[PDB]
Amino acid sequence: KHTPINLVRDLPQGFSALEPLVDLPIGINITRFQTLLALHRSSGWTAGAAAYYVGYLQPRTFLLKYNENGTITDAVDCALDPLSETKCTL
Amino acid sequence: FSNVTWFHAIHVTKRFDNPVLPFNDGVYFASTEKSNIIRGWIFG
Amino acid sequence: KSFTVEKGIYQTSNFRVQPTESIVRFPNITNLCPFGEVFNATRFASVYAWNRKRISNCVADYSVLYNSASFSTFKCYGVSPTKLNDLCFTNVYADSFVIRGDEVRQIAPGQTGKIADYNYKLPCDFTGCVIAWNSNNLDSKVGGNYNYLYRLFRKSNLKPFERDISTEIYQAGSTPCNGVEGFNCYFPLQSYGFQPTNGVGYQPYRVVVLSFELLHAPATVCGPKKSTNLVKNKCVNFNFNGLTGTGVLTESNKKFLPFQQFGRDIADTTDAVRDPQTLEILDITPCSFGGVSVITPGTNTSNQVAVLYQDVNCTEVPVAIHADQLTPTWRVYSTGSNVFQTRAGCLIGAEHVNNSYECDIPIGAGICASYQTSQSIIAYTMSLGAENSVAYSNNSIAIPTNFTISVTTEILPVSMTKTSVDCTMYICGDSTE
Amino acid sequence: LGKLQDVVNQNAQALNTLVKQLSSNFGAISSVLNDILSRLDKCEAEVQIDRLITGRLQSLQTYVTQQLIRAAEIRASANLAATKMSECVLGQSKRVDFCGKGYHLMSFPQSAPHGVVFLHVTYVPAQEKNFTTAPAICHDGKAHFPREGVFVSNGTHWFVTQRNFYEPQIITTDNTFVSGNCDVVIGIVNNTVYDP
Amino acid sequence: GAENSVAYSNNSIAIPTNFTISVTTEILPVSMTKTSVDCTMYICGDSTECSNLLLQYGSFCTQLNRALTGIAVEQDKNTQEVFAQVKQIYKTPPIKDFGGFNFSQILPDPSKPSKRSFIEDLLFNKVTLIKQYGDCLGDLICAQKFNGLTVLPPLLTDEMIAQYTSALLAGTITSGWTFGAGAALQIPFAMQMAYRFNGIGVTQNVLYENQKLIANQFNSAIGKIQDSLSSTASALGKLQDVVNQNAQALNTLVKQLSSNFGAISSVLNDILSRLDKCEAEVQIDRLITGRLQSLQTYVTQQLIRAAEIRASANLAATKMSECVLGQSKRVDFCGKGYHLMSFPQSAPHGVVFLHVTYVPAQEKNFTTAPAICHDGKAHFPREGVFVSNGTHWFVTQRNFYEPQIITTDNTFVSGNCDVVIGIVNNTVYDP
Amino acid sequence: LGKLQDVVNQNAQALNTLVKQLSSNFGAISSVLNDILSRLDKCEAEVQI
Ligand SMILES: *[C@@H]1O[C@H](CO)[C@@H](O[C@@H]2O[C@H](CO)[C@@H](O)[C@H](O)[C@H]2NC(C)=O)[C@H](O)[C@H]1NC(C)=O
Ligand SMILES: *[C@@H]1O[C@H](CO)[C@@H](O[C@@H]2O[C@H](CO)[C@@H](O)[C@H](O)[C@H]2NC(C)=O)[C@H](O)[C@H]1NC(C)=O
Ligand SMILES: *[C@@H]1O[C@H](CO)[C@@H](O[C@@H]2O[C@H](CO)[C@@H](O)[C@H](O)[C@H]2NC(C)=O)[C@H](O)[C@H]1NC(C)=O
Ligand SMILES: *[C@@H]1O[C@H](CO)[C@@H](O[C@@H]2O[C@H](CO)[C@@H](O)[C@H](O)[C@H]2NC(C)=O)[C@H](O)[C@H]1NC(C)=O
Ligand SMILES: *[C@@H]1O[C@H](CO)[C@@H](O[C@@H]2O[C@H](CO)[C@@H](O)[C@H](O)[C@H]2NC(C)=O)[C@H](O)[C@H]1NC(C)=O
Ligand SMILES: *[C@@H]1O[C@H](CO)[C@@H](O[C@@H]2O[C@H](CO)[C@@H](O)[C@H](O)[C@H]2NC(C)=O)[C@H](O)[C@H]1NC(C)=O
Ligand SMILES: *[C@@H]1O[C@H](CO)[C@@H](O)[C@H](O)[C@H]1NC(C)=O
Ligand SMILES: *[C@@H]1O[C@H](CO)[C@@H](O)[C@H](O)[C@H]1NC(C)=O
Ligand SMILES: *[C@@H]1O[C@H](CO)[C@@H](O)[C@H](O)[C@H]1NC(C)=O
Ligand SMILES: *[C@@H]1O[C@H](CO)[C@@H](O)[C@H](O)[C@H]1NC(C)=O
Ligand SMILES: *[C@@H]1O[C@H](CO)[C@@H](O)[C@H](O)[C@H]1NC(C)=O
Ligand SMILES: *[C@@H]1O[C@H](CO)[C@@H](O)[C@H](O)[C@H]1NC(C)=O
Ligand SMILES: *[C@@H]1O[C@H](CO)[C@@H](O)[C@H](O)[C@H]1NC(C)=O
Ligand SMILES: *[C@@H]1O[C@H](CO)[C@@H](O)[C@H](O)[C@H]1NC(C)=O
Ligand SMILES: *[C@@H]1O[C@H](CO)[C@@H](O)[C@H](O)[C@H]1NC(C)=O
Ligand SMILES: *[C@@H]1O[C@H](CO)[C@@H](O)[C@H](O)[C@H]1NC(C)=O
Ligand SMILES: *[C@@H]1O[C@H](CO)[C@@H](O)[C@H](O)[C@H]1NC(C)=O
Ligand SMILES: *[C@@H]1O[C@H](CO)[C@@H](O)[C@H](O)[C@H]1NC(C)=O
Ligand SMILES: *[C@@H]1O[C@H](CO)[C@@H](O)[C@H](O)[C@H]1NC(C)=O
């Protein structure tokens, strides 16, 4: 998912639903990974201001709200806190 | 409301960091970026 | 489930409408599929490096592909072979390789062994199938082919659909031998020996596995069936990219995302579809719909009846009964002189009467019906009772000068039959096993 | 006797459906155990007989649940019948329409198959006549009200009479009682009050 | 609750000097939605090859449809037994000379096209819940109807139920309890009220002495009811729970069509397009068993709820008989207090009773005694109790302080004045 | 106090039957999930579970 933003420090204060694109049949064991940075050059290099966030997925049960137009607008993480647990059960 | 490890590269030291990370049955990768620096990934 | 129905009103199901024609509507793809490249390939890949071919934009031809190649094992999971033509597949992948003879059984869900642990693993939730056929006349030469290899050793079994082309030395012993050959650490790959005159279990077998998933994503591969023109506002045996059902179709204005092709309601059935040839969003409804109540005086009194169609608007009931296809003995009850639009729906076969009586047969929404003698059925608003008015006044009383001693019979059940059941005798007809 | 016959019919019909449900296959090759046990060996006879056993036990449970529902209904009706036997046969009920349309005099029970029949005998006033009335009587500045009955007039005189039978009586001091002056009450009229 | 303590004493009584005419609203469900289900449409989405497989069961669905038909007939029963107590439509009189009492809020409004009253109009708005076909072709109800679930309409419409209610009100206010016991006589309203009062142990004089005040209290109480159910909507909880349960069980029933029950899918078209005869049969058997089982679960729950509603409806019929058609001596059956009368009002799938009752209000302590020794003989009262204001002795009826001088007609004599305990000395006037 | 004791007994006995019904196989190879999930792979563990 790609979105506009005008915040500089930390995550957005909101919620966005990710769409699929790709589903490549590579058949590869993956345990480690890495990111590919760039160099502005003119050791003779400089790096522009960029920030990347990494978060490990976990096996969880979620609840999803599909609006009338068919896009996810809200969700609940069951087992986050008791309130979300009750929203999950009910 | 999890905790995600923040990494960033800033001119300012110069803070060049992009180490190898574990890939434990999934990764969520978000980039707040302006000038096309966070561009690709390795997996293995 | 009897003959002598009693006086009353009875709900019934709808045996009325039956389909008469079939509709097939598949996309406009006529490219014959690249199956020669995967079946008629000069060299298949070694099993440890099995070759996955993408297949797309195909009119995927008939079931077994029984053209020249006689296929030994053709066993299909999730799809019956017979229906294999009728469908349109979303994401087809052809996994081709060659193995020895006796190991062909290992290519299936839940199997295990050399092939299904170190070389090529399948899932349980696998929809697709496995064409296996002998190719000793090609994939074996004198002296044995030293081109087809299999992974002899791995420190753990594979996950489904995972490839492993590594060549690190497998440390059978506890002492590492720094990646070279030696004692208790062996080369993980072993080459097959396929002599042209060796046993059936050692003859090279060509295997391909067509893996796909059905009726959840935009189809690109289509079966050999030729399309027709859909018959709208009338219920058919439609076929939209594989699904087989029955129901009237209608236009719609839902905003489908590009990667989505189906739309499901709360009941998990299809309520929105995209036509393959024409890019547009539609919706589906059934045609055997609507309740039907039948009003009868008790047979032994007549055979006339009336018919109530629930919640219909009988300026357009014949399109709801589908009165373009049914015996006339029902179509007389679809339209006639005796039509009456009650708030409960429309009533056919009984005349509306402006009187009001205490009623025999309830209909609904304040309407009842009866069989009166002018020998026919009548439908009317009931009479709540005799109209009356008490002459109230601030100084007038009414006092009785006489009385009656009435006797009223009223009946209450108290008990019912004390039944008893032996499970053993009922379930198991005195058989010990 | 509709209600009793409905009870009998429901009880005799649930059993008939119960036997008729032995003809269902429940996904098995047949619905007769002898067929399965003659045509099949141990293994697949077991796996089909499990289907049949599950289906038949399920239908048995359905029957028993329906019987529990009907038994609760019948227990409610029986508790009502016991209450009616207590309050109308063993006594006279002041409850309205509990034991007949009218003022209850008495009741008789009669047995019946799987139930009881009550002959409720009741008083129903029959022939009504209009009269002019008033709530009170001003004799000599004090207001008179009746103890039993109501003040009534045949056009000329005034009487007290009990309601559900016209039996006028002349106004006397024992027929009535006195409470306060004859100004507060609304609708009072003028008449003498005989003194025995 | 509030802590309290009654100052019990062997010679102290507390008697009311004033009262209140309270009106209490209490709500009973009577009917619920007459649902109906076509097995074939629900289990087998109008596919003939699934219908043939289902056909070997057969008796299961006859059983289910029979049960639901019984439920629907039972609901129309319940409405009949509650509202159709009297088969004479007494129209309300045109002139409202009821001795200060104002029934305009409960009686029908002729201006409105419907025969509902003001209160009935309010009651039909605090409950939320007819979808003609062509609306679905162009929602929960549409899915229900597409999956064989229909909601049959009640036999009696709301106008007709309101007409029954209006007849009951007219009979109650023009005739009293007489129209329940056969022929409807007539009685001026203030007299009927006098005698509803006599029924609770206060003499008819007290009403006529406080007729205007009592009518004012009744009118004010009716207004407070109007405000109290015009402001909040949780008052009609029971009816809304009935509606919600009935509309929610159906929603679970349709939502249970998404279960696989161990099959490859939950859509018959998928199974019938991807599979040949053999394994389509064996999977469709699983689906048929699961869906029929869920249908049976729904029907069983409906039978339970129908039994509950029948109990409530029998209670409502008993209340209509014993409190609208008469005055009940049963305690707390028809309101907290001594029952004077009751009014019915219709409501969606139920009934509302305005029970108007007598509540003694302002109590005063008095010294009392069980008896009076005049000249060696003991005197006991007929109606009321011996009471003292400190100096004199009077007889007074309980639920209103109206002392009377001790006379021979006020009392009676039985035996010498030694046996009784607590007797006191006083003269007994002789008229 | 028969009626109260019958209430208590029925309520405490239905629960006991409920736990005792965990021993039924319902046509499966066993009645303990650990047995099925240790002796069987994904496919047939699913179909028995
Ligand atoms: C995917 O790769 C990782 C490491 O590259 C494998 O995990 C190791 O497996 C060996 C034995 O096979 C163990 O000795 C190591 O302790 C494991 N290390 C870790 C971090 O797990 C893993 O087995 C591979 N996945 C598969 C299915 O084979
Ligand atoms: C009260 O009603 C009864 C009938 O319910 C009347 O009895 C009838 O009286 C007439 C003449 O007196 C006779 O010809 C009939 O044979 C009687 N019928 C029966 C069944 O007894 C009675 O007359 C009425 N009494 C009053 C005062 O009105
Ligand atoms: C009933 O009788 C009393 C007295 O006999 C009537 O009171 C008189 O009413 C007239 C007016 O109509 C006054 O002029 C007198 O002063 C009243 N006298 C007394 C002693 O009160 C009373 O009006 C009569 N009631 C009716 C309806 O005629
Ligand atoms: C009995 O209670 C009523 C109120 O419930 C009293 O009525 C009030 O009386 C006072 C003065 O008499 C008036 O200021 C009020 O306006 C009245 N309120 C209402 C609603 O009417 C009545 O006074 C009391 N009577 C006795 C004997 O105590
Ligand atoms: C009975 O109560 C109503 C109040 O609800 C009294 O006032 C009438 O109320 C309705 C609706 O608010 C209005 O349409 C009428 O115009 C009101 N009438 C008058 C005269 O103001 C009503 O008056 C009371 N009935 C009597 C006989 O007084
Ligand atoms: C009520 O009156 C009677 C007689 O007037 C009282 O009886 C007398 O009681 C006294 C003792 O207190 C005796 O000495 C007398 O002999 C009694 N005389 C008679 C005729 O009985 C009686 O005591 C009085 N009760 C109270 C509570 O004072
Ligand atoms: C849904 O789509 C319509 C048309 O694009 C639009 O008018 C409406 O604002 C959308 N509503 C939501 C909640 O996205
Ligand atoms: C990260 O977040 C979790 C919960 O928000 C917290 O327990 C943890 O302490 C945080 N990590 C550090 C280093 O504080
Ligand atoms: C496929 O191709 C043409 C052009 O897109 C289109 O008009 C046509 O309706 C499609 N279907 C068939 C059967 O040609
Ligand atoms: C495959 O090759 C053989 C000849 O070697 C030929 O007869 C056959 O038609 C070919 N089949 C396909 C699908 O190309
Ligand atoms: C029904 O028909 C039979 C014979 O035809 C007759 O004996 C019986 O009286 C009839 N019952 C009614 C209610 O018409
Ligand atoms: C549909 O029903 C309404 C009243 O229920 C009626 O006014 C209308 O004419 C009907 N539609 C048509 C096309 O007649
Ligand atoms: C019945 O009543 C309607 C409405 O008044 C009227 O149009 C119609 O002519 C009447 N029909 C008969 C047979 O009286
Ligand atoms: C009482 O008066 C009204 C009209 O004045 C009349 O219709 C009614 O019949 C009278 N009651 C009797 C029993 O005659
Ligand atoms: C009313 O009753 C009295 C009692 O004697 C009688 O004299 C008088 O004639 C009666 N008048 C009428 C109209 O009945
Ligand atoms: C009764 O009503 C009439 C007119 O409606 C009136 O003339 C008369 O004064 C009233 N009498 C009483 C006691 O209210
Ligand atoms: C009656 O007596 C007790 C104590 O003597 C007192 O608390 C109570 O308030 C009195 N009752 C009234 C209405 O005052
Ligand atoms: C008690 O009632 C009598 C009746 O006349 C009266 O004389 C006396 O003053 C009253 N005493 C008190 C304390 O109220
Ligand atoms: C009532 O009780 C008091 C003290 O508790 C006692 O003095 C008095 O004699 C008793 N009176 C009666 C009639 O019991």
Author numbering:
A (entry chain C): 206 to 247, 256 to 303
B (entry chain C): 59 to 70, 76 to 107
C (entry chain A): 304 to 676, 689 to 748
D (entry chain A): 945 to 1140
E (entry chain C): 700 to 828, 834 to 842, 848 to 1140
F (entry chain B): 945 to 993
Paper text:
We observed that the S-R/x3 spike can also be stored at 4°C for 40 days retaining well-formed trimers in negative stain EM. We performed cryo-EM imaging of the remaining trimers, finding that they had transitioned into the “closed” conformation, and that linoleic acid was no longer bound in the RBD. This suggests that both the locked-1 and locked-2 conformations are metastable at pH 7.4, and spontaneously transition into the closed conformation. We adjusted the buffer pH of the now “closed” spike to pH 5.0 and incubated overnight before determining its structure by cryo-EM. We found that low pH treatment had converted most of the closed spike to a conformation similar to the locked-2 conformation, however, in the acid reverted locked-2 structure the linoleic acid binding pocket is unoccupied. In the acid-reverted locked-2 structure of S-R/x3, F592 is no longer within cation-π interaction distance of R319 and instead forms cation-π interactions with H625 which is positively charged under low pH. Low pH is able to revert the closed spike towards the locked-2 conformation by restoring interactions in domain D and the domain C/D junction but cannot revert the S-R/x3 closed spike to the locked-1 conformation as the complex interdigitation involving 617–641 loop residues cannot be reformed. Using x3 stabilized 614D and 614G spikes, we found both nascent locked-1 and locked-2 conformations bind lipid, and that low pH is able to revert the 614D spike towards the locked-2 conformation.
The spike (S) protein of coronaviruses is responsible for interaction with cellular receptors and fusion with the target cell membrane. The S protein of SARS-CoV-2 is a large, 1273 residue, type I fusion protein, that can be processed by host proteases into two parts, S1 and S2. The spike (S) protein of SARS-CoV-2 has been observed in three distinct pre-fusion conformations: locked, closed and open. To overcome this challenge, based on the locked SARS-CoV-2 S-R/PP structure, we engineered cysteines residues replacing positions D427 and V987 to generate a new disulfide-stabilized S protein S-R/x3.
